[PDB]
Amino acid sequence: LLMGTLGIVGGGGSIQRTPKIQVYSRHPAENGKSNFLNCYVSGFHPSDIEVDLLKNGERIEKVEHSDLSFSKDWSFYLLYYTEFTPTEKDEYACRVNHVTLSQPKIVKWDRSGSHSMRYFFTSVSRPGRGEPRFIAVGYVDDTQFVRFDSDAASQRMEPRAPWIEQEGPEYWDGETRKVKAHSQTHRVDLGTLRGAYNQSEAGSHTVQRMYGCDVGSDWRFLRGYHQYAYDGKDYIALKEDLRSWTAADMAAQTTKHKWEAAHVAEQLRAYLEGTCVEWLRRYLENGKETLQRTDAPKTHMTHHAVSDHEATLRCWALSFYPAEITLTWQRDGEDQTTELVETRPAGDGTFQKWAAVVVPSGQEQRYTCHVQHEGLPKPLTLRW
């Protein structure tokens, strides 16, 4: 459930992060067997990005993407995907263009616990091009359950997980009403923030917001969050105590004093400690077959002989939920700190990850990958 009201900021350049690009299949590739081709673009700012999936260099038509969301550092990520049947001679690729790149990048396809509810909000001003783009997504744990997109046709809060379709019309109209009121607050903040930083009225700027609550194994309140960023940088955040604010610069201190005087933090606290956990608990219960599950990792190892004197061992974990996982390489039983790819979505609710270690050639059997995950009945140890 969304928060019932949302206070505007007071009156007090944009960052550039280049996208990481991962091109891969949902399941292990087998020629003749249908699959999903994924292009995962992450770590980027600002949000405007172009992404195509290519078959023999030509743009594939039936291509969907995930709803825009972002990481703890405010950088965005999106999954583009298509159903496909691989063959030996068909070539697949992902083409990304972004303002941080001097040319289009083409990446070939080479082959017990706590719970949370989180909402993520992005508003992007588009001067001369109507009102700001507003995208809202709601999650329970690592599972998206709702979305709103101001450029989609319906102008409704929309379901994105079967279990939320249990809610009646009052729920859907109510969340639509409140999400539109969220978009209003953000649209106002954009104009106010431009003026606050003496910025050109012709440029595009970004407001991001994240709020929500954690519950423990007992399903009672643990922690609450409310965080706000302008142009991919911290502006103001509610402290752990839910009683005070951390302002990033002098312009945000003005919002701090306004929000202190209007008792905003205390209105936030009632939602975060009350409404937020009540509805979290209710969602956990209504979707328990979906949400109260673990999917164990399916693990294997690959060996890439790079030189005459070294080799790289890649340890894989596939099709696991939730996303939290630990892969570590050991050298003769002692741990060894390698590269670690961003945990990427498979596209079906599950996740993928690998950890690689560069080892001297002829000492393969010396190393072992260890895989710790909530859904394994016991830990796994892989060897070569």
Short mmCIF file of C-alpha atoms in Angstrom, two decimals:
data_model
loop_
_atom_site.label_atom_id
_atom_site.label_comp_id
_atom_site.label_asym_id
_atom_site.label_seq_id
_atom_site.Cartn_x
_atom_site.Cartn_y
_atom_site.Cartn_z
CA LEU A 1 0.00 0.00 0.00
CA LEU A 2 1.23 3.48 -0.95
CA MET A 3 1.61 6.28 1.54
CA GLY A 4 -1.47 8.50 1.79
CA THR A 5 0.17 11.91 1.31
CA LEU A 6 3.55 13.32 0.29
CA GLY A 7 5.02 16.74 1.21
CA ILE A 8 6.75 18.93 -1.39
CA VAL A 9 10.41 20.01 -1.07
CA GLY A 10 11.52 23.58 -0.27
CA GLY A 11 13.33 26.13 -2.45
CA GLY A 12 16.89 26.09 -1.01
CA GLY A 13 24.88 19.62 -12.55
CA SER A 14 23.38 16.22 -13.43
CA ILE A 15 25.63 13.12 -13.14
CA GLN A 16 26.74 10.76 -15.93
CA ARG A 17 27.17 7.01 -15.25
CA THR A 18 27.88 4.67 -18.15
CA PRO A 19 25.79 1.46 -18.41
CA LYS A 20 27.15 -2.01 -17.67
CA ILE A 21 25.72 -4.44 -20.29
CA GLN A 22 25.15 -8.19 -19.88
CA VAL A 23 23.85 -10.38 -22.72
CA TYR A 24 22.78 -13.91 -21.83
CA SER A 25 20.02 -16.54 -22.01
CA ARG A 26 17.49 -17.27 -19.24
CA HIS A 27 18.42 -21.00 -19.22
CA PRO A 28 21.48 -22.92 -20.48
CA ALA A 29 21.61 -22.64 -24.30
CA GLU A 30 20.56 -25.72 -26.27
CA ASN A 31 20.16 -25.36 -30.06
CA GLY A 32 16.54 -26.13 -31.08
CA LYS A 33 15.17 -25.49 -27.55
CA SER A 34 13.16 -22.28 -26.85
CA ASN A 35 14.61 -19.90 -24.29
CA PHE A 36 14.76 -16.18 -23.46
CA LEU A 37 17.51 -13.81 -24.62
CA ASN A 38 18.29 -11.17 -21.97
CA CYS A 39 20.10 -7.86 -22.17
CA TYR A 40 20.61 -6.41 -18.70
CA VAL A 41 21.68 -2.77 -18.58
CA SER A 42 22.61 -1.36 -15.18
CA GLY A 43 24.52 1.27 -13.27
CA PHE A 44 23.48 4.08 -15.66
CA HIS A 45 22.38 7.70 -15.26
CA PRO A 46 20.44 9.58 -16.55
CA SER A 47 17.52 7.25 -17.27
CA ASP A 48 17.00 7.79 -21.00
CA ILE A 49 18.54 4.80 -22.76
CA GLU A 50 18.09 2.93 -26.08
CA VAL A 51 18.37 -0.85 -26.12
CA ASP A 52 17.78 -3.25 -29.04
CA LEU A 53 18.21 -6.97 -29.31
CA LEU A 54 19.64 -7.98 -32.67
CA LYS A 55 19.25 -11.15 -34.74
CA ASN A 56 22.00 -11.31 -37.41
CA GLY A 57 22.41 -7.53 -36.94
CA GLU A 58 18.70 -6.70 -37.47
CA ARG A 59 16.34 -5.27 -34.81
CA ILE A 60 14.00 -7.85 -33.27
CA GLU A 61 10.39 -6.56 -33.06
CA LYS A 62 8.76 -8.45 -30.16
CA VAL A 63 10.92 -7.07 -27.33
CA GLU A 64 9.66 -6.28 -23.84
CA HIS A 65 11.48 -4.59 -20.95
CA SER A 66 11.22 -4.40 -17.15
CA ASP A 67 9.83 -1.27 -15.45
CA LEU A 68 12.58 1.28 -14.69
CA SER A 69 13.98 0.86 -11.19
CA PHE A 70 17.28 1.72 -9.44
CA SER A 71 19.96 0.54 -7.01
CA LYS A 72 21.06 1.87 -3.57
CA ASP A 73 23.47 4.32 -5.33
CA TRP A 74 20.53 5.73 -7.44
CA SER A 75 21.86 4.25 -10.71
CA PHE A 76 19.16 2.74 -12.95
CA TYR A 77 18.74 -0.74 -14.36
CA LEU A 78 16.50 -2.40 -16.98
CA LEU A 79 16.08 -5.92 -18.42
CA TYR A 80 15.24 -6.25 -22.11
CA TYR A 81 14.12 -9.70 -23.20
CA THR A 82 12.61 -11.75 -26.00
CA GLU A 83 11.52 -15.37 -26.51
CA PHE A 84 13.86 -17.10 -29.01
CA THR A 85 15.06 -20.50 -30.21
CA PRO A 86 18.88 -20.49 -30.62
CA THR A 87 20.72 -22.17 -33.51
CA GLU A 88 24.45 -22.59 -34.25
CA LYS A 89 24.57 -19.93 -37.01
CA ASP A 90 22.08 -17.29 -35.82
CA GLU A 91 24.00 -14.45 -34.14
CA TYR A 92 22.45 -12.53 -31.27
CA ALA A 93 23.50 -9.21 -29.78
CA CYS A 94 22.43 -6.25 -27.70
CA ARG A 95 22.82 -2.66 -28.93
CA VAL A 96 22.81 0.10 -26.29
CA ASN A 97 23.10 3.83 -26.78
CA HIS A 98 23.38 6.33 -23.99
CA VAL A 99 24.58 9.94 -23.56
CA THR A 100 27.77 8.71 -21.76
CA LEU A 101 28.82 6.76 -24.91
CA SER A 102 30.44 8.41 -27.97
CA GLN A 103 29.07 5.60 -30.17
CA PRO A 104 26.51 2.74 -29.87
CA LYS A 105 27.93 -0.20 -27.87
CA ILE A 106 27.20 -3.62 -29.39
CA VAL A 107 27.65 -6.65 -27.09
CA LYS A 108 27.35 -10.09 -28.69
CA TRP A 109 25.72 -13.08 -27.06
CA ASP A 110 28.71 -15.36 -26.37
CA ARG A 111 26.99 -18.10 -24.26
CA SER A 112 14.00 -18.12 7.96
CA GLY A 113 14.76 -14.46 7.19
CA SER A 114 13.47 -10.90 7.05
CA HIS A 115 10.96 -9.39 4.61
CA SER A 116 10.59 -6.00 2.98
CA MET A 117 8.19 -3.80 1.04
CA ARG A 118 9.68 -1.02 -1.09
CA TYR A 119 8.37 1.51 -3.54
CA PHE A 120 10.66 3.19 -6.06
CA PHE A 121 9.78 6.45 -7.89
CA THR A 122 11.45 8.21 -10.84
CA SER A 123 10.42 11.60 -12.30
CA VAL A 124 12.22 13.02 -15.31
CA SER A 125 11.53 16.55 -16.58
CA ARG A 126 11.11 16.87 -20.35
CA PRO A 127 11.15 20.62 -21.19
CA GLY A 128 9.10 21.37 -24.33
CA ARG A 129 7.77 17.78 -24.34
CA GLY A 130 4.78 17.97 -21.97
CA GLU A 131 4.80 16.88 -18.33
CA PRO A 132 7.49 14.80 -16.56
CA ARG A 133 7.85 11.04 -17.13
CA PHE A 134 6.79 9.37 -13.88
CA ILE A 135 7.42 5.69 -13.18
CA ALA A 136 6.50 3.97 -9.91
CA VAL A 137 7.24 0.35 -8.98
CA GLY A 138 6.37 -1.59 -5.82
CA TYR A 139 8.26 -4.64 -4.50
CA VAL A 140 7.79 -7.24 -1.78
CA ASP A 141 11.30 -8.63 -1.14
CA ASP A 142 12.87 -9.13 -4.65
CA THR A 143 9.45 -9.57 -6.36
CA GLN A 144 7.74 -6.68 -8.14
CA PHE A 145 3.97 -6.55 -7.59
CA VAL A 146 2.76 -3.15 -8.99
CA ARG A 147 3.69 -0.39 -11.45
CA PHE A 148 2.58 2.99 -12.75
CA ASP A 149 3.91 4.68 -15.89
CA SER A 150 2.62 8.16 -16.79
CA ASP A 151 3.18 7.42 -20.50
CA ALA A 152 1.24 4.09 -20.51
CA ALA A 153 -2.37 4.17 -21.84
CA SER A 154 -4.38 3.12 -18.77
CA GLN A 155 -3.16 5.82 -16.31
CA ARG A 156 -3.81 3.18 -13.58
CA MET A 157 -1.74 1.47 -10.95
CA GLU A 158 -1.33 -1.93 -12.61
CA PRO A 159 -0.75 -5.43 -11.17
CA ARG A 160 2.56 -7.18 -11.90
CA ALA A 161 2.18 -10.31 -9.72
CA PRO A 162 -0.98 -12.59 -9.72
CA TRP A 163 -1.52 -12.40 -5.92
CA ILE A 164 -2.15 -8.62 -5.87
CA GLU A 165 -5.08 -9.23 -8.30
CA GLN A 166 -6.86 -10.58 -5.17
CA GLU A 167 -7.47 -6.95 -4.19
CA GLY A 168 -10.85 -5.47 -5.17
CA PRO A 169 -11.64 -2.29 -7.20
CA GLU A 170 -11.32 0.01 -4.13
CA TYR A 171 -7.68 -0.98 -3.75
CA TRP A 172 -6.89 -0.30 -7.45
CA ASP A 173 -8.74 3.07 -7.68
CA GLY A 174 -7.21 4.17 -4.34
CA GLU A 175 -3.63 3.35 -5.35
CA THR A 176 -4.17 5.03 -8.74
CA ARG A 177 -5.43 8.17 -6.97
CA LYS A 178 -2.45 8.20 -4.56
CA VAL A 179 0.19 7.36 -7.22
CA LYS A 180 -1.09 10.25 -9.34
CA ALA A 181 -0.81 12.47 -6.24
CA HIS A 182 2.80 11.17 -5.91
CA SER A 183 3.47 12.17 -9.54
CA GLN A 184 2.09 15.66 -8.73
CA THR A 185 4.43 16.12 -5.76
CA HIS A 186 7.40 15.04 -7.89
CA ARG A 187 6.42 17.32 -10.82
CA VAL A 188 6.28 20.23 -8.37
CA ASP A 189 9.63 19.24 -6.80
CA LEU A 190 11.27 19.27 -10.24
CA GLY A 191 10.36 22.93 -10.88
CA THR A 192 11.30 23.96 -7.33
CA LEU A 193 14.64 22.12 -7.43
CA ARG A 194 15.64 23.68 -10.80
CA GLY A 195 15.16 27.15 -9.31
CA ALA A 196 16.96 26.11 -6.11
CA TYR A 197 20.16 25.23 -8.07
CA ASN A 198 19.80 28.20 -10.54
CA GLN A 199 19.50 25.71 -13.41
CA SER A 200 18.44 26.19 -17.02
CA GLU A 201 14.74 25.65 -17.74
CA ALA A 202 15.69 23.86 -21.01
CA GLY A 203 17.58 20.89 -19.41
CA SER A 204 16.22 17.56 -18.10
CA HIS A 205 16.62 16.65 -14.41
CA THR A 206 15.77 13.61 -12.33
CA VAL A 207 14.02 13.11 -9.01
CA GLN A 208 14.24 9.67 -7.41
CA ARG A 209 12.57 8.47 -4.21
CA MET A 210 12.63 5.21 -2.27
CA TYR A 211 10.52 4.35 0.81
CA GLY A 212 9.36 1.29 2.72
CA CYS A 213 9.72 -1.02 5.70
CA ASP A 214 11.47 -4.22 6.79
CA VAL A 215 9.98 -6.84 9.12
CA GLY A 216 11.91 -9.65 10.84
CA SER A 217 11.10 -13.40 11.06
CA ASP A 218 8.38 -12.47 13.60
CA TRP A 219 6.79 -10.20 10.90
CA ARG A 220 6.93 -7.17 13.25
CA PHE A 221 8.58 -3.79 12.56
CA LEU A 222 12.36 -3.78 12.16
CA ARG A 223 13.37 -0.74 10.04
CA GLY A 224 11.83 2.07 7.97
CA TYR A 225 13.31 4.08 5.07
CA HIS A 226 12.57 7.28 3.20
CA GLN A 227 15.23 8.60 0.81
CA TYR A 228 15.23 11.23 -1.92
CA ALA A 229 17.75 12.14 -4.65
CA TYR A 230 18.07 14.92 -7.24
CA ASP A 231 20.10 14.13 -10.40
CA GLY A 232 21.42 10.83 -9.02
CA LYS A 233 22.81 12.33 -5.79
CA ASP A 234 21.49 12.34 -2.22
CA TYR A 235 19.29 15.35 -1.39
CA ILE A 236 17.51 14.46 1.87
CA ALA A 237 16.99 11.19 3.82
CA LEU A 238 15.04 10.18 6.94
CA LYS A 239 17.47 8.90 9.63
CA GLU A 240 17.18 5.34 11.04
CA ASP A 241 15.23 6.69 14.09
CA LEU A 242 12.38 8.08 11.84
CA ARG A 243 12.58 11.26 13.93
CA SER A 244 15.06 13.44 11.99
CA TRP A 245 16.51 14.20 8.57
CA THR A 246 19.94 14.07 6.93
CA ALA A 247 20.27 16.88 4.36
CA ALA A 248 23.08 16.59 1.79
CA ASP A 249 23.64 20.31 0.95
CA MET A 250 22.39 23.80 1.89
CA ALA A 251 19.46 23.63 -0.54
CA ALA A 252 18.23 20.42 1.20
CA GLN A 253 18.63 22.02 4.66
CA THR A 254 15.77 24.36 3.67
CA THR A 255 13.50 21.34 3.01
CA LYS A 256 14.71 19.89 6.35
CA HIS A 257 13.53 23.02 8.26
CA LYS A 258 10.17 23.14 6.41
CA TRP A 259 9.60 19.37 6.94
CA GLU A 260 10.63 19.66 10.65
CA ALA A 261 8.15 22.54 11.25
CA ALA A 262 5.27 20.65 9.56
CA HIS A 263 6.01 17.38 11.50
CA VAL A 264 6.57 15.39 8.27
CA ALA A 265 8.83 12.75 9.90
CA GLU A 266 6.11 11.90 12.49
CA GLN A 267 3.52 11.46 9.67
CA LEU A 268 6.06 9.21 7.91
CA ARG A 269 6.65 7.21 11.11
CA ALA A 270 2.94 6.26 11.44
CA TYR A 271 2.91 4.83 7.89
CA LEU A 272 6.29 3.12 8.12
CA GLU A 273 5.63 1.47 11.53
CA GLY A 274 1.89 0.87 11.01
CA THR A 275 0.36 0.83 7.55
CA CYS A 276 3.54 -0.39 5.88
CA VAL A 277 3.95 -3.50 8.06
CA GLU A 278 0.19 -4.28 8.14
CA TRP A 279 0.07 -4.36 4.34
CA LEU A 280 3.45 -6.13 4.08
CA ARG A 281 2.10 -8.87 6.39
CA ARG A 282 -1.14 -8.99 4.36
CA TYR A 283 0.79 -9.31 1.04
CA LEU A 284 3.14 -12.00 2.50
CA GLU A 285 0.07 -13.99 3.47
CA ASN A 286 -1.99 -13.47 0.25
CA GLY A 287 0.94 -14.43 -2.00
CA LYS A 288 2.65 -16.98 0.31
CA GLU A 289 3.07 -19.70 -2.38
CA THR A 290 4.86 -17.04 -4.47
CA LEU A 291 6.66 -14.96 -1.80
CA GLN A 292 7.36 -17.40 1.06
CA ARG A 293 9.57 -19.65 -1.06
CA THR A 294 13.20 -20.32 -1.76
CA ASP A 295 14.57 -21.55 -5.12
CA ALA A 296 17.93 -23.26 -4.65
CA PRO A 297 20.81 -22.34 -7.01
CA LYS A 298 21.69 -24.73 -9.84
CA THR A 299 25.44 -24.66 -9.93
CA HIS A 300 28.12 -25.60 -12.45
CA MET A 301 31.72 -24.67 -13.30
CA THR A 302 33.40 -23.57 -16.55
CA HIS A 303 37.11 -23.36 -17.44
CA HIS A 304 38.52 -20.76 -19.87
CA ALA A 305 42.19 -21.35 -20.79
CA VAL A 306 43.34 -17.75 -21.45
CA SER A 307 47.16 -18.16 -21.72
CA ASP A 308 49.84 -20.88 -21.47
CA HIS A 309 50.50 -19.87 -17.79
CA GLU A 310 47.03 -18.96 -16.39
CA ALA A 311 43.39 -20.08 -16.51
CA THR A 312 40.08 -18.66 -15.30
CA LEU A 313 37.55 -20.78 -13.37
CA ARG A 314 33.95 -19.46 -13.42
CA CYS A 315 31.54 -20.77 -10.80
CA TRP A 316 27.86 -20.37 -11.75
CA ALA A 317 24.65 -20.18 -9.72
CA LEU A 318 21.43 -20.16 -11.78
CA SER A 319 17.67 -19.86 -11.19
CA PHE A 320 17.71 -18.88 -7.49
CA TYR A 321 15.38 -16.78 -5.30
CA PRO A 322 15.82 -14.61 -3.29
CA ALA A 323 18.75 -12.75 -4.89
CA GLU A 324 20.93 -12.67 -1.74
CA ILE A 325 23.71 -15.24 -2.22
CA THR A 326 27.42 -15.83 -1.42
CA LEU A 327 29.96 -17.32 -3.85
CA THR A 328 33.56 -17.61 -2.61
CA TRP A 329 36.64 -19.32 -4.01
CA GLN A 330 38.98 -21.18 -1.66
CA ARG A 331 42.64 -22.09 -2.23
CA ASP A 332 43.43 -25.38 -0.42
CA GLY A 333 40.63 -24.75 2.14
CA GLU A 334 41.56 -21.10 2.96
CA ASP A 335 39.41 -18.28 1.52
CA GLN A 336 40.71 -16.08 -1.33
CA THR A 337 39.35 -12.59 -2.14
CA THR A 338 38.86 -12.42 -8.47
CA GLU A 339 35.89 -10.71 -10.15
CA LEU A 340 32.20 -10.71 -9.28
CA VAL A 341 29.57 -9.90 -11.90
CA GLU A 342 26.44 -8.04 -10.83
CA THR A 343 23.71 -10.44 -9.77
CA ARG A 344 21.44 -10.36 -12.80
CA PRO A 345 17.77 -11.34 -13.26
CA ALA A 346 16.86 -14.42 -15.28
CA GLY A 347 13.57 -12.77 -16.22
CA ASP A 348 11.24 -15.35 -14.59
CA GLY A 349 11.44 -14.18 -10.93
CA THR A 350 14.84 -15.84 -10.35
CA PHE A 351 18.45 -14.61 -10.43
CA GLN A 352 21.89 -15.52 -11.81
CA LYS A 353 25.41 -14.88 -10.57
CA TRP A 354 28.96 -16.01 -11.15
CA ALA A 355 32.32 -15.61 -9.42
CA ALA A 356 35.59 -16.05 -11.34
CA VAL A 357 39.15 -16.72 -10.13
CA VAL A 358 42.33 -16.49 -12.25
CA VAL A 359 44.50 -19.47 -11.30
CA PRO A 360 47.94 -20.74 -12.40
CA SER A 361 47.67 -23.44 -15.11
CA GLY A 362 48.14 -26.96 -13.63
CA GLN A 363 46.64 -26.10 -10.21
CA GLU A 364 42.90 -26.39 -11.07
CA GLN A 365 42.18 -29.15 -8.53
CA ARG A 366 43.58 -26.81 -5.82
CA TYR A 367 40.52 -24.52 -5.97
CA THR A 368 36.91 -24.97 -4.88
CA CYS A 369 33.84 -22.75 -5.21
CA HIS A 370 31.51 -22.62 -2.20
CA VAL A 371 27.83 -21.66 -2.57
CA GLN A 372 25.75 -20.42 0.36
CA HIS A 373 22.05 -19.75 -0.16
CA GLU A 374 18.87 -19.70 1.97
CA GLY A 375 17.16 -22.32 -0.23
CA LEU A 376 19.89 -24.99 -0.18
CA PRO A 377 19.27 -27.84 2.33
CA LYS A 378 23.10 -27.90 2.69
CA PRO A 379 25.98 -25.82 1.18
CA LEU A 380 27.55 -26.85 -2.13
CA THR A 381 31.23 -27.31 -2.92
CA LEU A 382 32.21 -27.53 -6.62
CA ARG A 383 35.59 -28.83 -7.87
CA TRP A 384 37.35 -29.38 -11.23
#
